[PDB]
Design goal:
It is classed as transcription activator. 2 copies of one chain form a homodimer. Chain A is an all-alpha fold. Helices cover 67% and strands 0% of the residues of chain A. The longest helix of chain A is centred in the first third of the chain and has 16 residues, at 7-22. Chain A is globular, with a radius of gyration of 12 Å. Chain A binds chain B through residues 4, 6-10, 49, 51-53, 55-56, 65-68, 70-71, 73-74, 77-78, and chain B through 1, 3-7, 43, 46, 48-50, 52-53, 62-64, 67-68, 70-72, 74-77.
């Protein structure tokens, strides 16, 4: 079939859903995370490989644990 | 909270242990050096999406199961 999801795609989709749940805009999270909205958008779309430290920062800004974001990302691997 | 790379690497190590596969065997099947695989297992280096998929494929493991294990190892709560 078409390609398997990449981790970064599944993780980006998880991050987007945690952001949407919190009702926070792209720009809002971007400023909170000290990244550009373009960067965040590309992360959310599975087009950036994020360092562990930056992922931890984005999750802290969402008030989410990395563990919870990662388990959600598993839900997008099929 | 552990770093993602630490969690992912420990999960890969666990899955390798469970299958009784040697570091050198899995590294070679993954077309990487065994020293690099060791670094990844100990969270010394980021585990990229593509590398994760390639090592899991060599392991006969689904990436999702490795993520579930990684997330479990990280729990503070």
């Amino acid at each position: 079939k078409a390609p398997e999801p990449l981790l970064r795609e599944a993780l980006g989709a998880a991050l987007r859903s945690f952001r949407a749940d919190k009702g926070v805009t792209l720009r809002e999270l971007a400023e909170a995370s000290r990244v550009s909205p373009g960067y965040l958008s590309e992360l959310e779309r599975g087009r950036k490989e994020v360092s562990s430290e930056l992922l931890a920062s984005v999750c802290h800004a969402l008030g989410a644990s990395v563990a919870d974001v990662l388990i959600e990302a598993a839900g997008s691997m099929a």
